[PDB]
Design a protein around this ligand. Structure first.
Ligand SMILES: Nc1nc2c(c(=O)[nH]1)N[C@H]1C(S)=C(S)[C@@H](COP(=O)(O)OP(=O)(O)OC[C@H]3O[C@@H](n4cnc5c(=O)[nH]c(N)nc54)[C@H](O)[C@@H]3O)O[C@H]1N2
Ligand SMILES: Nc1nc2c(c(=O)[nH]1)N[C@H]1C(S)=C(S)[C@@H](COP(=O)(O)OP(=O)(O)OC[C@H]3O[C@@H](n4cnc5c(=O)[nH]c(N)nc54)[C@H](O)[C@@H]3O)O[C@H]1N2
Ligand code: SF4
Ligand code: NA
Ligand SMILES: [W+6]
Length: 727
């Protein structure tokens, strides 16, 4: 029996695995008392993970495209050695012609947990700043906002909270089951629960207060709560006095958001919003667990800022409710391995997005350099995901060659075609590449567009030392269950082999991933054989707020309720809510043709993002891409529940199976993210196995009107109008 960090989704429950006599790997909830993962924390995605590891369609060998047009499905198996030789040769030619900045990378490291900083190390040595990640609108953006406010991304304590505030978070036995169990434990301790969700979910039913707000309006709801907490003086006067700046300015701002106005905006009742605010401030320690919905709105910046402000002012950073992370105290920081200082300033300045949405770039984050050196001993603190190219800028440079060409593109555990907005432009960008490399487990829609598809190992085939989002104040060890199948290799193998061919061997002394793991843990004096024997290693953290506290990694050293960085960048230093530019409020005329407010998302028990749609048990649990309409709404449109429809915005459309569902509020429509059809032939004739027909990014604009102005991420949750009609 092994303890393994499940990487079938990103919450990373620790499970137990065992190889049975017939070679099948059985996974189950950990039978021992685990320090972080509560009992009975395993879901169908994990239970059935071996059906993916052993799937007949898994790519186990390097494939070279031998067609005459990108996207043509004509593939020939080659060796790793030959693939790497050819990739390096072509990349050298591309870089000689277009500069190292012409290499773009989309990487989801949480899916791989294998490179330990060596990916950005490689890019920084080559001279490319053009790294991005689908986490540009999930956690990575949030960390930027947290950093300008209080220097580091915060973590909410389910164990210590006496009040939890949920934004969406449709937790269940198959959506972040460990956290589902954490919540249940909390409730039984007497912890109160406040749920903001237009959909009455199971967590909404469990809630002490359920606020059925209108899609997209969380920022307004939170401003209303801050109004109540400031005006009622329910805040922690000592923390505000000693550790915050800009409180008087914040106080003035929230007078713009009285409960009568917020009630009108949100569709919630004023008295309920007040109860929520009061409960949150008085039922300490009170936390707001990170939630995706507010990373995906036109008002995302303000909604995130407002959450940070709420936690700060009620005392959550000093009562155990919210913890400010750091590079792990026991380990060599990933940030240091990444060698951001090696990338020349000239190349940092070129990072795509610097000229449009600089906030999350090296340039936008630069005011945090000295503060980060001071507090964390790391000038370039790669907190969760950081120093990022803006995806719209990246795909636009790929597609148009402006402001300059990007001509090589690597997708590392990232179905990049489908992982952002404006999927048509991502396709155009990919079709204008001279080199595309896809490191994955399957012939995904993105891999279908590659010159080379390289087989990645699976989480049941690798050891892992955590944390692999730098900032998380603990790491769980993951044991290797089996050797990788076929010729699947680890992410560091790929990076090192390429680095050597690019002339960078001297900077990559670790001969394999195990040596790199041993380097990551080297300050402990242990090697991996000994290290893996303990489940969890907690990090020490700086003394932020004690009597001789060091404060936070912000320009002022204090919690910036009024953000100096935003002021600097020309953005509103304080949170606000403006109606998205495509709603029934901002555009009632457009709403005559497009009567539905759009929500793209709603995670499904049996799949993770675009993963696990291959024929099998998981696909069978939810086999079609499904639209959800309230029965009354569907009825009005003449669409029988269970019939195929198009859902169309001003940007584009996708095809879905209408299922009527009374929990979906009237006049709103759900579309899924990540849906495609791996059973189909690939290539453009099938829209890349249905990608072009069934993915939400087909209908999501990334014009400026649909971008968060400060972060440059796309709005997905409210703020967009749609129509639905029969196929
Ligand atoms: N339009 C839109 N975009 C979104 C979202 C949305 O709802 N809508 N969701 C956003 C959010 S919240 C997140 S967190 C991100 C998620 O983004 P990702 O986690 O990147 O998810 P996918 O886009 O499905 O691409 C993941 C790819 O990783 C491959 N893979 C899985 N495990 C491994 C492995 O061990 N090794 C290798 N080499 N490959 C592996 C899968 O086969 C898959 O092709 O997407 C974001 N992007
Ligand atoms: N099975 C499975 N589990 C997963 C994932 C998966 O793909 N599959 N993905 C994981 C990842 S990467 C993420 S980011 C999380 C996301 O986890 P969740 O937050 O659970 O995200 P969803 O399931 O997309 O939507 C949950 C609720 O958010 C609500 N919602 C939508 N828009 C808004 C809004 O504007 N305001 C408010 N208050 N609520 C809104 C919806 O009505 C829905 O009920 O799930 C994780 N867990
Ligand atoms: S929620 Fe399920 S898929 Fe995600 S880490 Fe936990 S067991 Fe794995
Ligand atoms: Na051209
Ligand atoms: W996510």
């Amino acid at each position: 029996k092994k303890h393994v960090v499940c990487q079938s989704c990103d919450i990373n429950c620790v499970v137990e695995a065992e190889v049975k006599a017939d070679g099948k790997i059985q996974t189950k909830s950990i039978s021992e008392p685990h320090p972080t993962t509560p009992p009975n924390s395993i879901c169908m995605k994990s239970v059935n993970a071996d059906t993916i590891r052993t799937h007949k369609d898994r790519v186990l060998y390097p494939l070279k495209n031998v067609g005459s047009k990108r996207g043509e499905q004509r593939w020939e198996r080659i060796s790793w050695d030959q693939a790497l030789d050819e990739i390096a040769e072509k990349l050298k030619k591309i870089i000689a012609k277009y500069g190292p900045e012409s290499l773009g990378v989309s990487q989801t490291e949480i899916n791989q947990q294998s490179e330990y900083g060596t990916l950005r190390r490689f890019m920084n040595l080559l001279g490319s700043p053009n790294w991005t990640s689908a986490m540009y609108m999930c956690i990575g953006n949030t960390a930027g906002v947290h950093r300008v406010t209080h220097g580091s991304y915060s973590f909410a304590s389910f164990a210590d909270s006496n009040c939890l505030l949920f934004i969406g978070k449709n937790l269940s036995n198959h959506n972040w089951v460990s956290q589902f169990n954490d919540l249940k434990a909390a409730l039984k301790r007497g912890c109160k629960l406040i749920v903001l969700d237009p959909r009455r979910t199971k967590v909404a039913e469990m809630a002490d207060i359920w606020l059925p707000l209108r899609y997209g309006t969380d920022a307004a709801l939170f401003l209303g709560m801050i109004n109540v907490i400031i005006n009622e003086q329910l805040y922690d006067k000592e923390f505000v006095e000693n550790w915050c700046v800009g409180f008087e300015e914040l106080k003035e701002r929230v007078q713009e958001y009285p409960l009568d106005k917020v009630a009108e905006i949100t569709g919630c009742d004023a008295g309920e919003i007040r109860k929520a605010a009061v409960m949150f401030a008085t039922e300490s320690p009170a936390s707001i667990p990170w939630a995706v919905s507010t990373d995906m709105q036109k008002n995302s910046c303000s909604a995130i800022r407002a959450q940070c402000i709420l936690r700060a002012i009620v005392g959550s950073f000093v009562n155990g409710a919210e913890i400010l992370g750091a590079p792990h105290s026991d380990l060599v920081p990933i940030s240091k391995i990444q060698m951001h200082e090696a990338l020349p300033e000239e190349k940092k300045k070129l990072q795509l997005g610097t000229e449009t949405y600089p906030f999350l770039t090296y340039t936008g984050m630069s005011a945090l350099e000295e503060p980060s050196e001071r507090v964390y001993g790391v000038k370039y603190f790669h907190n969760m995901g950081a120093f990022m190219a803006n995806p719209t800028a990246l795909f636009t440079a790929m597609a148009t060659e402006k402001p300059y060409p990007v001509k090589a593109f690597f997708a590392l555990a990232s179905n990049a075609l489908m992982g952002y907005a404006n999927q048509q432009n991502a396709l155009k960008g990919l079709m204008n590449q001279d080199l595309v490399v896809c490191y994955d487990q399957f012939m995904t829609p993105t891999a279908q567009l590659a010159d080379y598809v390289l087989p990645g190992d699976h989480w049941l085939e690798r050891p892992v030392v955590q944390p692999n989002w730098e900032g998380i104040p603990f790491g769980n060890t993951s044991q290797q269950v089996v050797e990788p199948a076929g010729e699947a290799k680890d992410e560091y193998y790929f990076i090192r082999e390429l680095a050597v061919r690019m002339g960078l061997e001297e900077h990559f002394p670790w001969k394999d991933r195990l040596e790199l793991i041993n380097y990551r843990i080297s300050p402990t004096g242990m090697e991996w054989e000994e290290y893996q024997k303990q489940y969890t290693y907690m990090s020490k953290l700086p003394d932020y707020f004690g009597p001789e506290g060091v404060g936070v990694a912000t320009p002022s050293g204090k919690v910036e309720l009024y953000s100096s960085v935003f002021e600097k960048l020309g953005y509103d230093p304080l949170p606000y809510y403006h109606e998205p530019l495509q709603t029934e409020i901002s555009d009632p005329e457009l709403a005559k043709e497009y009567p539905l407010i759009l929500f793209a998302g709603l995670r499904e028990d049996s799949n993770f993002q675009s993963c696990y749609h291959q024929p099998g048990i998981l696909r069978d649990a939810e086999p079609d891409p499904v639209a959800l309409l309230h029965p009354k709404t569907a009825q009005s449109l003449g669409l029988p529940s269970g019939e195929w429809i198009w859902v169309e915005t001003t940007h584009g459309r996708l095809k879905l199976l209408l299922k009527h569902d009374g929990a979906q509020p009237e006049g709103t429509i759900r579309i899924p993210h990540g849906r495609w059809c791996p059973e189909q032939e690939g290539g453009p004739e099938t829209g890349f196995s249905g990608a072009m027909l069934h993915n939400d990014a087909m209908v999501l604009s990334d014009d400026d009107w649909n971008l968060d102005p400060e972060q440059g991420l796309p709005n997905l949750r409210g703020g967009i109008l749609a129509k639905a009609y029969k196929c």
